Design a protein around this ligand. Structure first.
Ligand SMILES: C[C@@H]1O[C@H](NC(=O)c2ccc(-c3cccc(CN)c3)o2)[C@@H](O)[C@H](O)[C@@H]1O
Ligand SMILES: C[C@@H]1O[C@H](NC(=O)c2ccc(-c3cccc(CN)c3)o2)[C@@H](O)[C@H](O)[C@@H]1O
Ligand SMILES: C[C@@H]1O[C@H](NC(=O)c2ccc(-c3cccc(CN)c3)o2)[C@@H](O)[C@H](O)[C@@H]1O
Lengths: 131, 131, 131
């Protein structure tokens, strides 16, 4: 009933759209889970953003149906003196009965920001069923 | 065994006391849960605070018995150049056997701050029983 | 199936190595859990760091086998005007079958920082077994 994927880095990218964070992927269908609920946690404890205009990163939890939940961090200065690490966690509960076969973490730039993961990050789920 | 409530906004308020975040409410009694433990996650991934004196927000998890756990974020400048988004997660485990009928997220101003949610936020619980 | 430990303070320390956060300890063996998986959440919602050189704190989840996962927060200024509270959550899933008898939260200084907890912090686990 516990699913988990974790990474320690990702190639630095920018994106104006949500794009997969490589490695943060849970295959629900492959685990034989076809109904009930998943409580999903995207945990990016040590990201940073680089950019010229109050940098930050949007993160999402997505399924094959798209983004279920999202949020961001942003710095409080236009060009931070140093881009500090800004812990980020997002939590969503999904109905698998809706047609879900996978869960992924995604990211999007804030204002053109380059997006950095260079240490542990995780995607976690707990499956709960009323049966 | 998985409970969830989520919002995308709340009216902007100030408060010197913990006050409910509208919509972040789980009715435990209504789910027929009267004993065991709940692991509760309050997830406010994208809040900001506005104010004149090192702004921030306190968040709590509360039951009908009151606040079980709380914490805050605060900015590192007196009047931030821009009030950046400051991800916030709080996690507490409650004994339902103690007399619990609901769980809520609450917020309180730091130093007079106006409190802002204008995107996804969640309250989640997993029920665990030794029986 | 739900384990939890929580604190409201810890003596202020520095460390160049990961050192236990007193009180954030889960005894897995004592609970008779010897296989399956644990989804562990370290939740430090209100820490701050004090120091002279872009302060911050590293946090880890560790077992008797060592650190499984870690991350940090850091400020974006060399000597913050005020050291604001920087919420921190870390999530990891552990195989108990690997030889695990306890789970702990740990911390390490960033750049010599003194490490501060003076309010609620938690260590949480959910045990999941395929049996
Ligand atoms: C952009 C700057 O990044 C610096 N950190 C690192 O360069 C770094 C390199 C490896 C790690 C790192 C992190 C978390 C867990 C671990 C352990 N695998 C390792 O951090 C910060 O100190 C600074 O404040 C800035 O944000
Ligand atoms: C106060 C400023 O707020 C800005 N963001 C927004 O005005 C905004 C409007 C909708 C959203 C928003 C957030 C997270 C997920 C989603 C998607 N539903 C949408 O953000 C920041 O960029 C800036 O750094 C400051 O903090
Ligand atoms: C270092 C400064 O610390 C200040 N907060 C406190 O001195 C304080 C003392 C007790 C608490 C505190 C926190 C969270 C939950 C609770 C409730 N038990 C209580 O905070 C900040 O306001 C400021 O921005 C700075 O970070």
């Amino acid at each position: 009933p516990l699913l988990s994927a974790s990474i320690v880095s990702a190639p630095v990218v920018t994106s104006e759209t949500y794009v997969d964070i490589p490695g943060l992927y849970l295959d629900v269908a492959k685990a034989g889970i076809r109904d009930g609920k998943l409580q999903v946690i995207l945990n990016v404890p040590t990201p940073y953003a680089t950019g010229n205009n109050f940098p930050g990163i949007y993160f999402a939890i997505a399924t094959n149906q798209g983004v279920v939940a999202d949020g961001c961090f942003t710095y409080s200065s236009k060009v931070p003196e140093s881009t500090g690490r800004m812990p980020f966690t997002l939590v969503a509960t999904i109905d698998v009965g809706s047609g879900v076969t996978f869960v992924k973490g995604q990211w999007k730039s804030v204002r053109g920001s380059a997006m950095h993961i260079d240490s542990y990050a995780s995607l976690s789920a707990i499956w709960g069923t009323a049966a």
